[PDB]
Design a binder for this molecule. Structure first.
Ligand SMILES: Nc1ncnc2c1ncn2[C@@H]1O[C@H](COP(=O)(O)OP(=O)(O)OP(=O)(O)O)[C@@H](O)[C@H]1O
Ligand SMILES: Nc1ncnc2c1ncn2[C@@H]1O[C@H](COP(=O)(O)OP(=O)(O)OP(=O)(O)O)[C@@H](O)[C@H]1O
Ligand SMILES: Nc1ncnc2c1ncn2[C@@H]1O[C@H](COP(=O)(O)OP(=O)(O)OP(=O)(O)O)[C@@H](O)[C@H]1O
Lengths: 130, 597, 594, 221, 162, 112
DNA sequence: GATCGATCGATAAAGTTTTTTTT
DNA sequence: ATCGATCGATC
């Protein structure tokens, strides 16, 4: 259970002494799903000091809260925070000195890389006053 | 297999029909002049055995190479070393499923098609005989790669501690074949509901390449094998045609037999050609005698003089029509398209006039530019046809001025600046300012501003709308004959078979009589046109005293000397005469007084 | 190499009679290189073996050079290098060949390929339009051990030996040879060579129109680099060669060609159809043909032998084409030492006929046709990555116009882009741009030839003679001569016209082009204190008779009135400004202004 | 316009490169059937399924409906039921979609096999409805009306390439519609633009163009 | 001038005039190194090669190696000197150029303390020594034996400067 | 994304000598007012909204329209902006030409 | 059963002049 | 061409 932010390979504790971590087969039958979307937000008009490139961030809607967020309106959110990296996986090969903190983050137990950490945000419940 | 081979060296040296013994008697006749090729004609092959055909028509690639090796051995025998391998050319005529069977059963099966080739590519090289060296022990082998499943039929092995891939491709003892990657387009009349057509890809061999120019109908026989290129989801592949024999129609580079000109010389001895073509060109056109004479001289042309200094004379003519609707100015133009050797039909809107001449683009390999398209690069020797010279107001005028009168364009765009050759001949048909009221007012206002386009053309007809209450009923008698009952399919087979000329014989005919005789007008005939011209300018200036302005200049005068050169190409006489030249001005003097009215 | 060397050995004793006439030539070219350089207070190693002298008395040694030219060239090098030191060694670079002669039907136009003479000799002509970079490349470095003080020696082969199929050495600096010495390398004692990739088009006149011009490419070496300008009728001949691995590489090379056709060649020859040599005989005839007092009038009508009259025009072209000098001001802006004439005419009066026969006698002046594209005098940062990671400003049409002439058509029938383009490049000799790269002030000495048509038909007499076509008068001010071609009807004129179009369906040109390209390199008088006096009287009257007549003039028109007479004395080939030059310059303007 | 009936499926490839790699999965809709655009979506049991399959109960019936004596006086009266009006338009507009024949010929000029009516009406009679009603009763149609009809977008046009592609040919209205319906009333500002591109769909019938592309000729009767 | 410097002028000393363009900034280059293990304190030294290099292991020293516990290496800035560096490109005088081709650029470097003494627009000349450098990237499918050289500066002789 | 510029962000308190006043006027004609309009040389792009100084004199030579400027005709037939001329400038000059017998031959001697 | 050594496989590339409708 | 990971062999 509990596939993490990159755990596309459940490879722990087989029943018999078979070849553990040898393969997998993502069954579309029993593994129940849920539906989501990824939208961007923006800061309200009555708080900007000047035209000073008003920054933003990104959210994730998880439950039934999909499609309740009509785009282009003043809106409120739940408030759980999160940080999500994704640089090393099975498929595709993974300016300034952005990600300079990442050099500290090296040398995990798997292969030596430069793993970053970017701030993001998760929601649970939406409301739209106005 | 070897057994199968034993069954072809023992077959292509004694197959015959009744005492002609043909296949030895052309293989010898193809080893003297260097061609190294066969024409099996598979429908004529079947006389041995249906089984040996059926080991061919059900399985591929293996059969072609075994047959090729057998032919090479027989060729080697007919001699007593410089002996190359041969190539095959097969041909049949079953029927052409046009572009509909795609995947069902026609994968690696013999097939016959029909299309129009539009796009050639530059040549290339693949190898066929190699000599391979190893790094570690200086081993030496030789591997031949004949037929294909494109490359990667077999790869270089590992055999000769010893490191893998130890082998290299030297270039000192090798041979090479060229491929094409020319692209076939569907003949645009036989997939009709509402859809755009599609396209395929095809390669070939050296001794049957460079036999096509774009703009022709071709029939083609070959294989439907499948390659796989890794520069899309499921593990897919792509289709292409390995081709064998382009036994198409004529070229439409003047090599042909002798009996094709035998009847042509037997026809040209009859001095009735000029009056009979005016009937025999357009079998569904009510008369229009003055215009019909102008089309046969446009298709033939004059000459090209590169006289001993730098300049040259533009030896061709360019007619122009205009007139009321409903008077055959448009439907006549599809008729000249099929009869021409090379003909292009871009007759609408001008089609973004900068794109008429040449175009560049970013090209996906190497991110570069070169020159690809144009409506004038492909139409050399032949004739283009366009219309609607009123409501192309943007840039049609600036795109034909350099294109005409010197035929030497040069593209000044981001890459090359080259003067590519052109020998084109233009043709157009337009509308005046709604026809009728233009011919009931001051007789200008035809082209609204410029006379400078009219001075580049020379020959101009002006049709009109009379009310002759006698001949029109014969025209109303004429259209009901052709339109239903179709008796002209039976009338023009019971008056044509001894008198008239069919529509496809002229396409055979014009390409021969142009490319042989280089004519010249009579030198004592120069007194005639000089005495003719001096009153025409007097006939001009008698009108300008009436507060009348506009167009006649000297360029039409050096067009009449091309007009009298035109019928000399028809009669194929190297000298001209005076019965010749007086009929030519008889055509132009019926378009001299048009400037008055 | 025992059996593959005896015929190489037999050639070494054979062809020593073939350079009975060149064994002087091989040593005489280098004894002054041993004397120029030793006494400073320069030539490559080029040994032109004629094909005749080898064909004249050898067959088997001759036949291999046009069938299998892959075993036979480093023979002729190997004899040639030991016949240089054995000639001259006492004073304390392999002398490769050039190989000129005839060939016997190997003039393969590269629209056609070979099917039989792959990997053989081939003569190829055409025009080049690519002109890629220049970059050095090693052949051999010399390693050195600092400890124990002894050197080493290593050669690295590439696709430049042209004939042998060497095992490649893809190493850059093999360090730490079988010792314990930290290796060094004297790079001054190393040796280097350069490459240049150039693609050649087809000469687009003898290729019959069924295709666009194709192209192949050629890799040459150090002797003939920077020799070919883009736009030269070049002639080259070298070996034919394929390289690269293709079709049988490790996996999945389906329907991919793998044989890059290349040419490793020699002897790049310009042609002319600057090289015009002339003896004492023909150089004295033009001195004898500088003698008469009529040669400006004879040369005028001996130019275009098809069109009547326009002797004001026919003198103007030859006056312009030879051109005038520009004395550049020391620490000052030079003025417009070029000359830029213009024509306009009511249509079909041969106003465009005479613009293209100047291109046959152009003397390396290739013009465009004026198509509505930006690139007339710029690049717009076309780089094509210059083989993966380099940016170059490839010149459009001003690398060719330098000390030459151009001609373009349909001035009024253009968009606004060329109007600002010919603005700067006329008042200023050069152009400078940082499109996506760097500013660069590349120079160009050029001169235009114009052509345009009036819009409103036959209206050049009933309206203003000025403001007549309304293209911006900045260009009209920057040009001088605006000829208005008349075509009025005279009954003897057109009668004479009617026969001269009939007698053209059947003192000379190459003597004419030799005359100007010899008179472009002689003296320039500029000075006569009284010929300058008559012209200012010849101007100030019409300076007071400019508004009382049709056209107003400006002050820069005075710089025309010296410049026409300056080149008019160049027709005389004299170091003195005479008096008679100030009469042709008068009435030529008097026809252009009345 | 199409609408598709099939199954839903998933393919968790475990690799996506627009967003980051994440515990997500793509979408693939395989199909079992496909039908054409439908019209007047108000039915309950018919005219949504393209049956058009005149097998037994129709073809055995449809002969005796053809051997009567006043059918052409009955069909055109009963064609457009909602509008009583003057007779002659319903004679013409029924004749228009019935069509003639593209009778080919030997190696000579082809013959137009089309009939092209033109209505003229007062502003307030039923002329805008018969054209609206005949759009349903045809098999295929188009309704490019009024302003906004481009001078090129009716016929074929070239859409430029995406980031690694070639200049391909993507036609618009007239190549799709075999029996199309336009409304050329008086869009006068664009009347001098488009009307040079529709009056050669009839005259030089099967017109196609070569603006900066390939010289081809599509066939649209 | 740069139009004729193609040949035997590698590894030599040649002065060339020109026009200085594309002045970069001053960046610290590396000449010595000192990794710290925080156990034995033996700061390891090494020479600096071209523009890319690689650190070493931690079980290599003489005290903090060779035991069951090893001092894990990491760097330190101030235990190593750092030099100056600035890059510039040259063009031609627009009068020694021939009638044909466009001018050709070149790369130059600086060392020692000649830095911060050039300007964009300086009609100057540099005197310096010659060296080609390898590319060390994509060595098989490109850059077989190519050079893409530069020149190394020694002296600048600038001119025309109540 | 460095802050490259033209003249007025680097020619502060100096001389800005311009030519060709009828060239690229869709951006020029506003900005030349903005130095005579006091202290608004700025970069009001999407990047930032910072404003630097403006202290430079202007010397302008507006070339006339077609032909000679007809002196019998009205002025402001070849000048573009009247609002700059009325109060945003102070004084004008002119370079008329009259055919003169005495002066132009000296002017001919001035150039010969 | 664990550790070390050897062999095999996978990893690094780059853009910005012509042409369409539109205001 | 270099680095990392996996597999096989030896202690
Ligand atoms: N002179 C003629 N002889 C025979 N048939 C003719 C003639 N003129 C017109 N036609 C007939 O007219 C029919 C249709 O022509 P179409 O409708 O293309 O004319 P159109 O293009 O309007 O005329 P125009 O070319 O003057 O505009 C053709 O089938 C053709 O047979
Ligand atoms: N004034 C003339 N005298 C003699 N021949 C002439 C004259 N005008 C035209 N010609 C003949 O016309 C032919 C070509 O004329 P050309 O095409 O150059 O006209 P043009 O200058 O192109 O006119 P435009 O530029 O207005 O199209 C030449 O072969 C030439 O013999
Ligand atoms: N003869 C008629 N029978 C039944 N209804 C009619 C009749 N004439 C008009 N109508 C009704 O009048 C309404 C108005 O539409 P109408 O057909 O008048 O538009 P129109 O005037 O044809 O428009 P346009 O002039 O733009 O084509 C229609 O909905 C239609 O139902």
């Amino acid at each position: 259970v509990e596939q993490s932010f990159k755990y596309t390979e459940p490879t722990f504790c087989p029943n018999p002494s078979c070849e553990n971590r040898a393969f997998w087969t993502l069954n579309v039958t029993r593994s129940r799903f849920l539906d989501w979307q990824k939208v961007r937000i923006q800061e309200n008009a009555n708080e900007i000091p000047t035209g000073s490139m008003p920054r933003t961030l990104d959210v994730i809607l998880r439950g039934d809260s999909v499609e309740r967020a009509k785009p282009g309106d003043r809106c409120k959110f739940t408030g759980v925070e999160i940080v999500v990296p994704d640089v090393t996986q099975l498929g595709l090969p993974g300016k300034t000195t952005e990600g300079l903190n990442s050099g500290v983050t090296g040398l995990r137990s798997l292969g030596v890389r430069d793993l970053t950490y970017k701030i993001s945000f998760l929601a649970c419940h939406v409301i739209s006053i106005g | 297999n070897t057994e199968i081979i034993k069954s072809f060296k023992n077959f292509i040296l004694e197959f015959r029909l009744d005492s002609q013994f043909i296949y030895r008697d052309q293989l010898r006749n193809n080893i003297l002049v260097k061609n190294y090729s066969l024409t099996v004609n598979m429908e004529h092959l079947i006389g041995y055995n249906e089984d040996i055909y059926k080991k061919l028509s059900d399985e591929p690639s293996d059969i072609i190479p075994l047959f090729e090796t057998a032919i090479t051995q027989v060729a080697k025998r007919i001699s007593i070393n410089s002996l190359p391998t041969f190539q095959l050319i097969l041909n049949s005529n079953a029927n052409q499923i046009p572009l509909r069977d795609l995947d069902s059963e026609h994968v690696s099966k013999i097939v016959r098609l029909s299309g129009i080739i539009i796009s050639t590519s530059v040549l290339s090289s693949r190898a066929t005989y190699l000599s391979i060296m190893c790094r570690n022990c200086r081993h030496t082998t030789s591997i031949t790669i004949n037929n294909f499943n494109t490359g990667n039929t077999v790869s270089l092995p590992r055999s000769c501690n010893c490191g893998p891939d130890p082998y290299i491709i030297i270039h000192e003892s090798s041979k090479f074949i060229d491929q094409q990657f020319l692209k076939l387009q569907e003949i645009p009349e036989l997939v009709p509901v509402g859809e755009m057509p599609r396209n395929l890809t095809m390669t070939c061999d050296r001794y049957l390449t460079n036999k096509v120019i774009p703009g022709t109908r071709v029939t083609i026989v070959g294989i439907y094998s499948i390659y796989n290129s890794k520069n899309s989801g499921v593990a897919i592949r792509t289709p292409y045609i390995k081709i064998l024999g382009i036994q198409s129609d004529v070229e439409t580079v003047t090599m042909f037999t002798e009996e094709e000109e035998e009847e042509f010389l037997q026809l040209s001895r009859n001095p009735k050609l000029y009056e009979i073509l005016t009937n025999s060109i357009a079998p569904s056109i009510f008369g229009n005698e003055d215009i019909k004479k102008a089309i046969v001289c446009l298709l033939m042309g004059g000459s090209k003089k590169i006289l001993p200094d730098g300049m040259r004379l533009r030896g061709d003519i360019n007619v122009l029509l205009l007139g009321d609707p409903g008077t055959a100015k448009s439907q006549l133009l599809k008729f000249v398209e099929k009869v021409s050797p090379i003909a292009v039909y871009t007759s609408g809107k001008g089609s973004s006039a900068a794109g008429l001449t040449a175009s560049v683009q970013r090209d996906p390999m190497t991110r570069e530019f070169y020159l690809e398209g144009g409506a004038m690069v492909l139409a050399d020797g032949g004739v283009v046809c366009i219309d609607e010279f009123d409501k192309m107001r943007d840039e049609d005028r600036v795109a034909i001025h350099e294109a005409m009168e010197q035929q030497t364009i040069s593209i000044a765009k981001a890459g090359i600046t080259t003067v590519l050759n052109s020998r084109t001949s233009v043709l157009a048909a337009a509308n005046p300012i709604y026809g009728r009221y233009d011919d009931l007012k001051s007789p200008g206002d035809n082209i609204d501003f410029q006379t400078t386009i009219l001075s580049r053309f020379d020959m101009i007809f002006i049709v009109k709308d009379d009310h002759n209450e006698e001949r029109d009923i014969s025209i109303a008698n004429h259209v009901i004959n052709i339109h239903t009952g179709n008796a002209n399919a039976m009338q023009n087979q019971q008056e044509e078979n001894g008198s008239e000329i069919s529509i496809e014989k002229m396409k055979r005919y014009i390409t021969y009589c142009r490319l042989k005789c280089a004519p010249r007008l009579s030198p004592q005939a120069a007194e005639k046109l000089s005495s003719n011209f001096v009153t025409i300018r007097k006939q001009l200036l008698i009108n300008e005293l009436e507060s009348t302005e506009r167009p006649i200049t000297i360029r039409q005068l050096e067009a009449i000397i091309r007009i009298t050169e035109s019928l000399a190409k028809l009669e194929l006489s190297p000298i001209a005469q005076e019965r010749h030249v007086d009929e030519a001005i008889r055509l132009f003097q019926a378009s001299t007084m048009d400037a008055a009215s | 190499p025992d059996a593959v060397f005896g015929d190489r050995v037999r050639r070494f004793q054979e062809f020593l009679d073939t350079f009975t006439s060149y064994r002087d030539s091989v040593r005489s070219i280098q004894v002054y290189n041993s004397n120029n350089a030793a006494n400073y207070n320069i030539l490559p190693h080029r040994i032109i073996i004629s094909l005749d002298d080898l064909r004249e008395f050898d067959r088997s040694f001759w036949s291999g050079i046009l069938v299998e030219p892959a075993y036979f060239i480093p023979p002729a090098e190997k004899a040639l290098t030991d016949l240089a030191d054995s000639m001259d060694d006492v004073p304390h670079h392999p002398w490769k060949l050039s190989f000129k002669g005839s060939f016997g039907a190997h003039a393969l136009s590269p629209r056609t390929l070979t099917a039989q003479h792959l990997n053989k000799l081939v003569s190829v002509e055409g025009i080049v339009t690519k002109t890629s970079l220049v970059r050095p490349k090693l052949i051999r470095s010399v390693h050195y051990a600092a400890k124990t003080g002894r050197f080493h020696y290593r050669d690295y082969t590439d696709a430049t030996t042209t004939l042998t199929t060497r095992i490649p050495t893809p190493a850059i600096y093999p360090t730490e040879d079988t010792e314990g010495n930290k290796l060094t390398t004297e790079y001054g004692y190393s040796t280097f060579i350069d490459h240049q990739r150039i693609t050649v088009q087809e000469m687009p006149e003898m290729a019959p129109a069924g295709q666009l011009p194709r192209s192949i490419d050629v890799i040459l070496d150090d002797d003939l680099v920077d020799k070919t300008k883009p736009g030269d009728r070049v002639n080259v001949v070298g070996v034919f060669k394929s390289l690269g691995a293709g079709g049988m590489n490790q996996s999945n090379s389906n329907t991919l060609i793998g044989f890059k056709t290349l040419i490793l060649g020699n002897t790049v020859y310009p042609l002319h159809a600057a090289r015009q040599m002339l003896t004492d005989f023909d150089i004295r005839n033009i001195n004898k043909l500088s003698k008469k007092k009529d040669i400006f009038d004879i040369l005028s009508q001996s130019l275009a032998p098809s069109i009547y009259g326009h002797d004001h025009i026919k003198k103007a072209i030859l006056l312009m084409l030879m051109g005038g000098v520009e004395k550049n001001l020391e620490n000052g802006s030079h003025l417009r030492g070029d000359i830029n004439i213009l024509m306009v005419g009511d249509p079909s009066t041969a106003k465009s006929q005479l613009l293209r026969f100047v291109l046959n006698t152009a003397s390396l002046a290739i013009a465009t046709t004026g198509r509505g594209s930006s690139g007339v005098g710029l690049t717009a940062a076309v780089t094509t990555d210059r083989e993966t990671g380099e940016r170059r400003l490839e010149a459009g049409a001003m690398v060719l116009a330098d000390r030459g002439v151009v001609c373009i058509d349909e001035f009024d029938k253009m968009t606004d882009v060329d109007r600002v383009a010919i603005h700067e490049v006329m008042e200023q000799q050069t152009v400078t741009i940082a499109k996506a790269g760097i500013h660069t002030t590349l120079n160009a000495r050029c001169s235009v030839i114009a052509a345009a048509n009036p819009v409103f038909g036959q209206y050049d007499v009933n309206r203003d003679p000025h403001q007549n076509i309304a293209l911006p008068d900045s260009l009209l001010s920057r040009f001088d001569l605006l000829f208005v071609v008349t075509d009025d009807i005279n009954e003897i004129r057109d009668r004479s016209i009617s026969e001269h179009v009939l007698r053209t369906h059947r003192v000379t040109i190459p003597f004419l082009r030799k005359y100007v390209q010899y008179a472009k390199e002689r003296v320039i008088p500029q000075l006569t204190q009284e010929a300058i006096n008559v012209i200012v009287k010849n101007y100030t009257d019409l300076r007071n008779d400019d508004n009382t007549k049709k056209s107003p003039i400006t002050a820069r028109t005075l710089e025309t009135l010296i410049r026409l007479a300056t080149a008019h004395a160049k027709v005389r080939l004299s170091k003195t400004v005479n008096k008679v030059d100030a009469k042709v310059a008068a009435n030529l303007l008097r026809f252009a202004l009345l | 316009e199409v609408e598709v009936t099939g199954i839903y499926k998933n393919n968790y490839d475990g690799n996506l490169n627009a967003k980051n790699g994440f515990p997500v999965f793509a979408t693939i809709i395989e199909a079992n059937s496909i039908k054409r655009r439908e019209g007047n979506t108000a039915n309950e049991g018919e005219e949504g399924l393209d049956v058009f399959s005149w097998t037994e109960e129709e073809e055995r019936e449809f002969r005796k409906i053809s051997r009567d004596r006043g059918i052409i006086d009955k069909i055109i009266s009963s064609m457009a039921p909602s509008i009583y009006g003057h007779r002659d338009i319903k004679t013409a507009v029924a004749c228009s979609l019935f069509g003639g024949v593209p009778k080919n010929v030997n190696g000579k000029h082809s013959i137009r096999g089309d009939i092209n009516v033109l209505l003229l009406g007062d502003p307030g009679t039923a002329k805008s409805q018969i054209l609206k009603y005949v759009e349903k009763t045809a098999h295929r149609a188009v309704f490019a009306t009024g302003q906004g009809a481009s001078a090129v977008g009716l016929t074929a046009s070239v859409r430029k390439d995406p980031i690694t592609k070639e200049w391909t040919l993507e036609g618009g209205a007239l190549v799709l519609a075999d029996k199309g319906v336009c409304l050329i009333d008086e869009f006068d500002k664009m009347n001098d633009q488009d009307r040079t591109s529709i009056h050669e769909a009839m005259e030089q019938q099967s017109i196609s163009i070569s603006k900066a592309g390939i010289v081809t000729t599509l066939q649209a009767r | 001038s740069v139009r004729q410097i193609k040949g035997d002028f590698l590894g030599q000393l040649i002065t060339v005039r020109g026009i200085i363009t594309r002045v970069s900034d001053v960046k610290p280059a590396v000449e010595v190194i000192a990794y710290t293990c925080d156990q034995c304190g033996y700061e390891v030294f090494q020479e600096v090669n071209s523009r890319t290099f690689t650190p070493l292991s931690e079980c290599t020293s003489e005290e903090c190696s060779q035991n069951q516990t090893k001092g894990q290496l990491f760097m330190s800035t101030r235990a190593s000197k750092f030099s100056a560096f600035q890059e510039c490109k040259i063009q031609e005088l627009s009068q020694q150029v021939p009638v044909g081709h466009i001018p050709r650029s070149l790369n130059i470097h600086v060392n020692g303390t000649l830095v911060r003494s050039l300007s964009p627009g300086d009609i100057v000349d540099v005197t310096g020594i010659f060296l080609p450098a390898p590319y060390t990237g994509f060595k098989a499918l490109k850059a077989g034996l190519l050079t893409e050289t530069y020149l190394e500066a020694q002296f600048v002789r600038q001119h025309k400067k109540l | 994304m460095i802050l490259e510029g033209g003249a007025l962000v680097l020619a502060d308190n100096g001389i800005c000598c311009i030519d060709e006043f009828d060239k690229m006027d869709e951006s020029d004609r506003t900005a030349i007012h903005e130095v005579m309009e006091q202290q608004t040389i700025s970069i009001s792009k999407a990047g930032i909204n910072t404003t630097l100084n403006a202290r430079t004199s202007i010397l302008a030579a507006a070339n006339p329209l077609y032909g000679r400027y007809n002196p019998r005709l009205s002025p402001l037939d070849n000048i573009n902006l009247p609002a700059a001329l009325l109060s945003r400038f102070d004084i004008l000059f002119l370079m008329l030409d009259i055919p003169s017998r005495d002066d132009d031959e000296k002017l001919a001697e001035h150039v010969t």
